[PDB]
Every structure is written in C-alpha cells, then in structure tokens.
Amino acid sequence: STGSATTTPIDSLDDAYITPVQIGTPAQTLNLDFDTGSSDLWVFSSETTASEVDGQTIYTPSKSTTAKLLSGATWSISYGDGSSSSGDVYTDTVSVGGLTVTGQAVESAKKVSSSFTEDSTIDGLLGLAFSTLNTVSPTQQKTFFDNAKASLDSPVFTADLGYHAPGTYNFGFIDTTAYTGSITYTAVSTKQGFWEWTSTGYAVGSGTFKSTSIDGIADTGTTLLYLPATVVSAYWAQVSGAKSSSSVGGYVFPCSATLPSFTFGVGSARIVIPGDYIDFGPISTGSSSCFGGIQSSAGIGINIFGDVALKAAFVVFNGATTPTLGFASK
Ligand SMILES: O=C(N1CCC[C@@H](O)C1)C1(c2ccccc2)CC1
C-alpha cells in the first residue's frame, strides 16, 4: 500500500504545516501537524476543556462506530517550545492520503497549553519519530508509520515541504519526479528516539565550505534551523546590522537586508537553503526588525534541522530495519 497527502503552510511565514487526516467512521477530517520530532498522534476532541478550544476542528469519538476507549490509558507530552497537552486514548481507524491504519491510538486531549488554543489552524499532531518516545501510559503505543510499515510497498515516508507553498507527505514510495539529481543517504541513530544524523558541514552564501560534523535531528515539527552558536554567528556576521537580541529571543536583522544562502552537507552532497527561506518577517507588526530563521541551539541541548532546512530538500525517512535519512535537492 501507499498514501499521498498534501501539506499546507498554516500562514504566510511557513510557521508550521498542516495535513488532512481522516479519523473514525464516518470519517472526521482533522488538520494535523506532522511532526518527525515526536511520537504521539493527539487531537483536539469533544473531551477538550471547552475554554481551551478556539476554532479547532475536534474529534468526537462517540460519533465514530470504530472508536474504542483504550481502558486506563493516559498521555501527557511537553514540546521543545514549552507547549503541552494531555488526555486519554481511543483506538480508531486513521487514514492519510488513502493509506489506512486500523486500531491506531488516537490520543484525545483533555487539556492543551495556551499556544495550542491560540492556533486555530492546528487540530492536533501526528508524530513520526520512533515509537519509543510515545507517551501513552501504562502501555506505550505505536506511531501511524510504525503501524502502517509492514503494509507499505517500501518502509519509508518522504517529506517535501514547500516554501510559501503546499508540499507533500508520501508513505510507502519514493516519487522520483519530485527531486533533482540523486538522493544522498546518511546514517541515523535512534538512541534518543529521533531521526538523528550528522551533517558534514556548512557554508554561508558563496563562502567556502567548512567540513565539520554537526549532529542533529530532522524535525518537521520545528519551524526554524537550530545550530551551534559558532555556526549561527558565522551566518549572521554576513548580514549588516544583524544581532542577537535577548529581549526578542534570538537573532534579528534589518528587514531591508538581502539574506545570504546557507548550505548544509549531507555526506559529500550539499543542500542549499536560499536566503529568502531564512526571513521570518517583522518581530512585531510594523517593525523594521525581522526575525531570523537560523538560530542558536545552545539553550536546547540538540541541533534541529527544522522546516527552514527541510523545505530546501526532498527528504526520505527510511524506516528499514536499520533506518537512514536521504536528502535530495529539488
Ligand atoms: O501552533 C504552534 N505553532 C508553533 C509556533 C508558531 C505558530 O504559528 C504555530 C505551536 C506548536 C506547534 C507544534 C509543536 C509545538 C508547538 C505552539 C503551539
């Protein structure tokens, strides 16, 4: 089997991407944030504290003939940005782009943090990291990909995120028309439950490439590119007027600037992120200070190849017995 679904930016800045997902019988379609950095499929629901729902589409298990309460099971998760949600668990039929999993754990939110309430465009998350990170207790549950894997034509999914444009998540096949040149594959460590890999270095603009190992995660659920402070300083040094602002929470730059590209290594191959992809616009409405898309990972504890990086590439998440990651230009 295979599945193919379009993923759409939630706003003009590509702050996140949403992908329609069918849950239950008859289908209830929710727009979920596919997140390769976590492993819970959770949704706004009829059980979510009413004051914490503001425009989201909710899953109502009592209206689904295939929903079954997973007795005794609860979940609770916190994300890198300090957001969180928690609740109880149903199993139900879940389809993405024509690919159906029966008995998928669908984590129903009783509580969500303010950041989720305030984003009317995201109805939940669909985790695509390794199932070892799944938070369901006392019986850990499998991700949608982990459940679908054995039925797929090939045990893979691909992320093809657009810059200010829709893109695609494919399950079970590699669309050879969706990228240029060849896909370069690179080793993955699953020890922390992430799609963790080691970039071979970087370049800033037309500068010379610096060979250096940068260990990080491929995370579709993180907006920006978070890299070591040395690397980030070298980037922003090439933008007149750019500075790290403690008050704003990272590097900012004059909105009148033309940003240089940033290149990252994947083995001997190179992925080029155009300068425009690094512009996240005014820090507040009407400001001439703009927020940068490349930021320091110093305060995080891990480097994160988020959407800014991934949208520059066609990315293969290969879930074979020994997982790997593949990157191609497009
Ligand atoms: O809605 C979110 N956004 C991310 C920040 C920019 C916003 O436009 C979108 C939040 C989120 C999404 C996915 C994972 C963790 C947190 C904070 C709730």
UniProtKB/Swiss-Prot annotation:
Iron-sulfur listed as a keyword: no
GO biological processes: proteolysis
Residues annotated as the enzyme's active site: D35, S199
A molecular function (GO) term: aspartic-type endopeptidase activity
Peptidase A1 domain ranges (all copies): 17-328
Disulfide bonds: C255-C290
UniProt KW keywords: Aspartyl protease, Disulfide bond, Hydrolase, Protease, Signal, Zymogen
Catalytically driven reaction(s): Hydrolysis of proteins with specificity similar to that of pepsin A, prefers hydrophobic residues at P1 and P1', but does not cleave 14-Ala-|-Leu-15 in the B chain of insulin or Z-Glu-Tyr. Clots milk
Hydrolase found in the keyword field: yes
EC number in record: 3.4.23.22
Class of the enzyme per the UniProt entry, highest EC level: hydrolase
Family named by the database record: Belongs to the peptidase A1 family.
Protein name per Swiss-Prot or TrEMBL: Endothiapepsin
Gene: EAPA
Portion held of the full protein: 90 to 419 of 419
